[PDB]
Amino acid sequence: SGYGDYSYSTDRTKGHVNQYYVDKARSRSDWGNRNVLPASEGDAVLGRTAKGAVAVPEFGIPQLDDPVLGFGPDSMVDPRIAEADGAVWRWDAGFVDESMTLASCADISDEAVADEAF
Amino acid sequence: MKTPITEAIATADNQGRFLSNTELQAVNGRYQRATASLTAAKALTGSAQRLITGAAQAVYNKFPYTTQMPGPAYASSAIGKAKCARDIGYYLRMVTYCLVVGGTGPMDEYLVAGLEEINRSFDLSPSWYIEALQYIKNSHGLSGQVANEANAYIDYAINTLS
Amino acid sequence: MKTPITEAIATADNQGRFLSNTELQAVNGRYQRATASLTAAKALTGSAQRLITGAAQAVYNKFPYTTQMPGPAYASSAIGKAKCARDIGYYLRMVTYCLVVGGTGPMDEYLVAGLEEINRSFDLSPSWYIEALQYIKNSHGLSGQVANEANAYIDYAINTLS
Amino acid sequence: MKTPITEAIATADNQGRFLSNTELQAVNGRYQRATASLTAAKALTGSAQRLITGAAQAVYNKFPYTTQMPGPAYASSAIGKAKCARDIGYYLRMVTYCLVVGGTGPMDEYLVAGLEEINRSFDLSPSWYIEALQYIKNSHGLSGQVANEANAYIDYAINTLS
Amino acid sequence: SIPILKYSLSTQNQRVESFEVNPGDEQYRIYSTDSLPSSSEVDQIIWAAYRQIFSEHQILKSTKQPFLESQLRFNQISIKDFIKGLVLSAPFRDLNYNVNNNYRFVEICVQRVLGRDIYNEREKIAWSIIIATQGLEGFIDTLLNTQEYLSNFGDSIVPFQRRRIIPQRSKGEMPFNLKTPRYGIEFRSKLAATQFSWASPIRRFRPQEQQPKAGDPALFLNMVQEMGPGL
Amino acid sequence: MLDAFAKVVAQADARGEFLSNTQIDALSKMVKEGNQRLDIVNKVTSNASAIVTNSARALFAEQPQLIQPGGNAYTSRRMAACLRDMEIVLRYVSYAMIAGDSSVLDDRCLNGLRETYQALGTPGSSVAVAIQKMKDASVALANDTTGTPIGDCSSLVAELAGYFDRAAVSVV
Amino acid sequence: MLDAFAKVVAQADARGEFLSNTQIDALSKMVKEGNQRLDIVNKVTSNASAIVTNSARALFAEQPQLIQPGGNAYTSRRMAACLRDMEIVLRYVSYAMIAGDSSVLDDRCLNGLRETYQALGTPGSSVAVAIQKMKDASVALANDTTGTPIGDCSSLVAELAGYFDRAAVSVV
Amino acid sequence: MLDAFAKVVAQADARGEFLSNTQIDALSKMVKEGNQRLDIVNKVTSNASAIVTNSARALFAEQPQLIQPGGNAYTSRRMAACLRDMEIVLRYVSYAMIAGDSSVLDDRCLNGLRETYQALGTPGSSVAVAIQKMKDASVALANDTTGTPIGDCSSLVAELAGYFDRAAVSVV
Amino acid sequence: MLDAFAKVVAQADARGEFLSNTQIDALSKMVKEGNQRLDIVNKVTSNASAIVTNSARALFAEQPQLIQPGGNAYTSRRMAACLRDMEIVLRYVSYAMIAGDSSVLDDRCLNGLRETYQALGTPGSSVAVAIQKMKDASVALANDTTGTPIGDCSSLVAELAGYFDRAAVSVV
Ligand SMILES: *CC[C@H]1/C(=C/c2[nH]c(/C=C3N=C(/C=C4\NC(=O)C(CC)=C4C)C(C)=C\3CCC(=O)O)c(CCC(=O)O)c2C)NC(=O)[C@@H]1C
Ligand SMILES: *CC[C@H]1/C(=C/c2[nH]c(/C=C3N=C(/C=C4\NC(=O)C(CC)=C4C)C(C)=C\3CCC(=O)O)c(CCC(=O)O)c2C)NC(=O)[C@@H]1C
Ligand SMILES: *CC[C@H]1/C(=C/c2[nH]c(/C=C3N=C(/C=C4\NC(=O)C(CC)=C4C)C(C)=C\3CCC(=O)O)c(CCC(=O)O)c2C)NC(=O)[C@@H]1C
Ligand SMILES: *CC[C@H]1/C(=C/c2[nH]c(/C=C3N=C(/C=C4\NC(=O)C(CC)=C4C)C(C)=C\3CCC(=O)O)c(CCC(=O)O)c2C)NC(=O)[C@@H]1C
Ligand SMILES: *CC[C@H]1/C(=C/c2[nH]c(/C=C3N=C(/C=C4\NC(=O)C(CC)=C4C)C(C)=C\3CCC(=O)O)c(CCC(=O)O)c2C)NC(=O)[C@@H]1C
Ligand SMILES: *CC[C@H]1/C(=C/c2[nH]c(/C=C3N=C(/C=C4\NC(=O)C(CC)=C4C)C(C)=C\3CCC(=O)O)c(CCC(=O)O)c2C)NC(=O)[C@@H]1C
Ligand SMILES: *CC[C@H]1/C(=C/c2[nH]c(/C=C3N=C(/C=C4\NC(=O)C(CC)=C4C)C(C)=C\3CCC(=O)O)c(CCC(=O)O)c2C)NC(=O)[C@@H]1C
Ligand SMILES: C=CC1=C(C)[C@@H](Cc2[nH]c(/C=C3N=C(/C=C4\NC(=O)[C@H](C)[C@H]4CC)C(C)=C\3CCC(=O)O)c(CCC(=O)O)c2C)NC1=O
Ligand SMILES: C=CC1=C(C)[C@@H](Cc2[nH]c(/C=C3N=C(/C=C4\NC(=O)[C@H](C)[C@H]4CC)C(C)=C\3CCC(=O)O)c(CCC(=O)O)c2C)NC1=O
Ligand SMILES: C=CC1=C(C)[C@@H](Cc2[nH]c(/C=C3N=C(/C=C4\NC(=O)[C@H](C)[C@H]4CC)C(C)=C\3CCC(=O)O)c(CCC(=O)O)c2C)NC1=O
């Protein structure tokens, strides 16, 4: 069908309904009255994070070349990482909720819950 | 932390007051000083692997009993030498963090809080790390106020170790 | 007071700690800003006698009932006009003190502490002084960051009056 | 509140003691005074719509700049006149509540707590309400100790406004 | 003569000692009179005592006591006597005491004077009896004379929330002014003249809250782009 | 609490990693707009009283159920509580503006605020209205060119609006 | 806390209403029985020790499982706690009697009392028994004609019994 | 808190019972091993530093994910927190050893400890490992015959191991 | 406390005087030596441990009656009290050095110090010796040219020595 191909499914646009109070962000005055915040990093302001900070290149230089000492694939995740980016508050975009995660449901290989179940 | 930014925010929040022109000048003084200390941290990062091994060798030259005395606290075997190089890397990394933050915020958070508890429990003397820090202070090859920015955070760690 | 100097000393004394590189940058930011605010205070000092009478006349033009209504709170007689010019001089003098100190230290010490007690007991409205301060903010004839230094301490007093 | 009843209960509860004959006489003095102040409140309720508009007109006659000066704080337009009559009604209603409670209980929790804040934030002088309360004090048409009961709670509000 | 009944301890941050030689910026500015303050800084000490014991909220003017202040700056009373004057103060006795039972009021007074949370429910139930049988005066005397208050604040330091945040971490414990407001979920529905308990968000036809997309020119807003100084 | 420099420092520490050179340019361009960052908070601080008072005035002009008798702003003390609640948020947003990130805003202003308003019976959606009324009032004031040199500071204005948005959805 | 006058004052304020003349009729007849109201609280106050002691004595004569070993009144300190718990309720009922309504009884005596006894393991039904034993002891004493002029005060006696009933069902 | 004598006293009080003669022999044989009870806590107290330090050293030799960067013992202050957490448990176990029962261990050491480690993100199973590494380090040291008359004290050693087990399952 | 700018501001306020132009040059030349003022306190802060330790070591080499048994430094806690007393004075002298005047030194360090040492039995003349031993240890270190541009800062060195002298005569 080609590259630039129209689909109703992929049309997030108010062209089929004429809601004329909805437009692309444009003026500097638009941040106070109509627009809220980018919902992802592709929609972010040029060269800044989704929250408005300058984007930094995400990775450093590994000190301490060592398999037993030194950071590796076995190292545990420091809890202050999620605190630094603000993912620990429920009003943050990256706030994880584990109550509806697939990981929270019961294993079925476990014989115990299976016989409890049948 | 003890960034100038957080220090200025804490006083104004403790008055329960807005950010006056007092705190803005305190932030401006951090800003016009960062262009000297960020070059210091960039220079210390690239010079790191030389400085770590040089400091570790200077410690063994100053205290040669540390490589010969048997025991878990000494660098007599290979695990002890690896742990010693790891500790010198920790100190240099904290110095580079304090350089780009501005002020001794990271190293009070990571190094000095509970340090002599570690040195007394794991039975290791603080004179070794002083000798290691003196080598880094003497041989980073910096000058101007770049060296002044580096040596302040070096001598802070020397003062807390002594 | 709320000089940057005293603010930096108070935090370090409250840790019970020496003056680190945190507070030295806070002092350095006051130092490299004073060369703009001292010229502002020198300019506001020489322009003072014009600005006082201009602000007092602007208050009477904005609120003409203050010169006609009889009573001790109003500038209907000569003692009231003298006291009004005295009060405008007090506000301008406190602005010039805050300019050379750096930060709103003097005017919290002298003006704003207990001010609405005075305004309620001696029965005088704070809108008159707001109108007087707006004239001084509009007609000091400064520009660049000199005007930025003046207008910060003007608008501080406007905010505490409102 | 500051009813005599609650005042007598608070002292006895603060001793952790029963209601002795001290507090019973304090309650009895409220009881034999209420037959004078309840007639005052009944008379002020029926005379209310006249007194509100009379006080609002007296304020505009005393301060005629309030109807001519443009701005949101003044009674220049219709919404300002409606809000002014609303405020005079609030003051008269609080006086009538204090009349049958006995003592300044309602108006301290409703009017005077945080009133200086409202008058400074919303840019309005307390002399207008003093002028309005003087009209109500002069023209309620009461006499005997009925007028004595009314004027005490009028002058309480005048004292807290000044 | 009815001693106070025993409760068990819990695990809290202040029961353990922090190491922290040379602390960070989460120190809460110990406001002592042994630093010899000026008339400027005694106003800050007075304001911090108002902020700790009263909320940020009753630092209105009908709540301010000019006379404990004038006796504090003449060295007639100490800071501990100033806190005792503020808890037994007259706006505190109708804006925090008449709107609680004895159980919520004791956790208010433990959180704001002792600078720590309760240990469990049994501590609230245990200390609740002193208020009823001795008045607020007896309760605040036996609270201010504990070893816990004297070992931490003494007689000359404004109390504060002791050891709120762990020092690595950003998110710490909720501040006690936000954790316990003036009244709770009880007492509010009919007695504190509060109604409807919740709020659906405000609906409107001009939306004002839409997220910008990836091709909008507002993302590329810019001005004065190149200096082009000289030749 | 953390500022924007200490945040990437905590990221790099919790991974034991030296800061790469590209992160140093990411920090140098935050240093580059230091004066423009300071001008915004200076302009907000100089107008803080008129921001809160005009936003509060416009709130009750369109939501008159709050100041009428029975409302949750019908007192002089509930009204003074409301004005001072608005100043709190304006204070902590300006703290987060010079910090560079919203740690101090999230940490000691917004944490537990929704539960507080639910316990008090305060309508949180009307708080959210007043926060966005302060937001556009401060944004239009931060685009004023009086007393500043000629230039671009639009990305900082979007960053400032983000903090008001974060405080607005945290209270409903 | 509120008394009976402040209660309708709050009613009339929360709808912004002037007090009608009929409500002034309703308040003046409360003023009319002031001496008879004061006469009761006085008789309860001068007999307060014998009320609590005789009611407590008659409670364990018919519920002897409490003072036998293992019971929730088998100590000298649990027993002194029980007597002082009964004095608390007798105190706050007499506070509500001169207030005219049960705000101070509900507010700082009964709020959270059922949960307290459930946390302690105290049987709340036996507290409810002791409260009604104080109730009839104080009611029969408030119908004594010694030291008072001859008249009618029966509606006030029913109002006094209502507070004891409200405290009785509040702790089960 | 209670020791072993006060515990049977509370048992006998809460049913109002005189202590039988057989309970007096049960207490006399606790008196009989008093010197042997004191020797154990004396030997643990004299080696308390080397117990904690060797157990902590052997913990990170086999769980090296804790002291590597990102771990919950990667600081100098989290590490000093860990050593001092181990000394706390060694202190309260030795308190319970001379008390005779685990009231003071359960009451002001273990109550709320699992929830604390869950709130901090500390792995409680690795705390349970370190507690059992202190356990047999102290048990093998309490079976040392230097400085004591030679005799039997094995039941006391099992009682000492029981407290370490109780503290171990209390924190997972 | 006051710095040097706030001191002339208090002088000018307490007679209601505008600041003359000559006082503005007096303040501008204090601004002129700001970097040289900061270098001194930076060099003192970087050597603060070796200042106190070497001065204290040289004090007991020549006054050995203090550390011998019976002396006022014969303990480990009286000795640690002495070292920490010397750090206090070195701290507050450095505070006064960046303040420009000795208000914070006189106000919260030296006020009541002579009476304290008289109440404790501490010999104040030996404190005065140790203060002057720290004085030239810091003065000879502030005339070091390593890490600074070569220039004149001698009047600031005399100002620094004045604070040590003021603290020395305040303690006898
Ligand atoms: C210069 C090398 C000298 C030396 C090193 C050595 N160190 C250890 C053990 C530890 N060192 C630390 C120190 C830190 N850990 C940190 O995370 C930080 C910064 C946040 C510091 C400063 C700690 C906690 C330990 C114990 C855990 C570990 O890392 O293994 C050892 C081993 C000691 C022992 O096994 O008991 C050595 C040998 N010692 C020397 O001999 C060199 C001179
Ligand atoms: C613009 C003039 C308007 C005006 C002035 C007026 N003021 C007063 C009286 C006082 N003003 C003050 C204010 C200060 N005193 C201070 O020392 C300071 C700074 C530290 C301030 C801001 C005080 C204390 C008084 C009372 C004592 C006094 O100075 O006389 C009066 C007299 C009021 C009276 O007599 O009751 C007037 C007339 N009023 C106007 O009408 C002008 C618009
Ligand atoms: C005599 C009329 C004068 C006048 C009135 C005026 N008032 C306002 C605004 C407010 N007034 C209040 C005062 C109260 N509210 C209460 O609930 C109570 C008792 C519990 C009092 C005393 C408040 C809170 C406001 C702001 C909210 C509101 O009611 O609208 C205004 C409007 C001011 C503005 O829009 O900023 C006016 C005009 N002003 C005059 O000019 C008359 C002389
Ligand atoms: C625009 C006004 C809105 C409003 C405000 C309102 N708030 C309260 C009560 C409280 N608000 C807080 C919030 C904070 N306290 C803090 O210390 C901080 C700093 C981080 C915040 C954000 C708290 C704890 C309370 C309860 C304490 C108190 O009583 O003041 C009230 C009620 C006041 C009262 O009932 O006495 C109001 C009215 N409510 C509105 O309707 C507006 C939308
Ligand atoms: C007739 C005796 C009944 C009884 C009483 C009993 N009560 C307790 C314990 C408490 N009672 C309270 C109740 C209050 N405390 C207050 O401050 C107020 C004022 C509003 C009231 C109504 C509380 C808080 C406690 C716990 C505190 C305490 O320990 O005293 C006890 C137990 C005492 C103890 O266990 O040490 C008893 C025995 N119990 C009965 O069996 C009778 C029916
Ligand atoms: C072997 C080390 C293990 C470990 C320890 C660890 N603990 C903490 C933090 C806390 N531990 C407690 C526990 C107690 N506090 C007490 O007062 C008592 C006495 C009854 C006990 C048992 C508490 C309250 C804390 C939080 C307070 C604090 O911050 O210190 C920490 C974290 C310290 C920090 O984050 O700053 C560690 C690392 N963790 C491990 O990984 C080992 C298994
Ligand atoms: C070089 C050591 C000299 C010395 C010191 C010494 N001092 C003390 C006791 C105290 N010193 C102070 C002084 C201060 N306290 C402060 O908070 C401040 C800050 C402004 C100062 C300057 C105080 C209050 C005491 C008493 C409190 C205490 O006991 O520590 C002691 C005695 C300690 C003791 O007896 O336990 C010594 C030995 N004494 C010498 O001989 C040296 C000359
Ligand atoms: C005392 C406290 C204190 C401050 C308030 C700042 C203020 C300040 N800002 C600028 C300098 C500037 N300030 C701004 C900011 C703005 N310009 C605009 O047109 C917009 C309205 C607004 C954006 C938010 C810009 C954009 C520049 C650089 C000029 C440019 O390139 O456009 C300068 C000159 C130095 C420079 O070139 O950077 C100063 C001193 N600095 C301080 O020390
Ligand atoms: C010092 C504290 C103090 C008090 C205790 C009261 C007591 C008091 N009560 C009455 C007066 C009265 N007291 C009562 C009450 C009673 N009569 C009975 O027969 C019943 C046993 C009981 C009902 C509960 C009645 C009914 C009257 C009015 C006489 C009547 O009309 O029957 C009077 C005479 C004044 C009057 O006529 O009202 C006084 C002084 N007043 C006080 O100042
Ligand atoms: C100053 C503090 C203080 C102490 C530490 C104790 C120590 C102590 N223990 C024993 C006496 C004893 N101590 C022990 C204990 C042991 N023996 C062993 O072989 C095991 C290694 C260990 C078991 C845990 C035994 C078993 C006896 C009695 C000897 C026997 O019958 O075997 C005695 C001699 C008195 C007696 O016969 O009971 C003393 C003084 N008493 C004190 O006052």
Ligand SMILES: C=CC1=C(C)[C@@H](Cc2[nH]c(/C=C3N=C(/C=C4\NC(=O)[C@H](C)[C@H]4CC)C(C)=C\3CCC(=O)O)c(CCC(=O)O)c2C)NC1=O
């Ligand atoms: C980060 C914290 C911080 C500091 C520590 C200072 C340090 C500092 N000092 C100087 C600059 C200077 N510093 C000194 C001071 C001295 N030179 C000597 O030879 C003596 C040993 C010593 C006297 C006490 C002098 C004298 C100058 C000016 C050079 C001269 O004219 O001689 C400069 C260059 C700028 C200038 O020319 O003034 C800087 C950056 N500034 C800071 O921001």
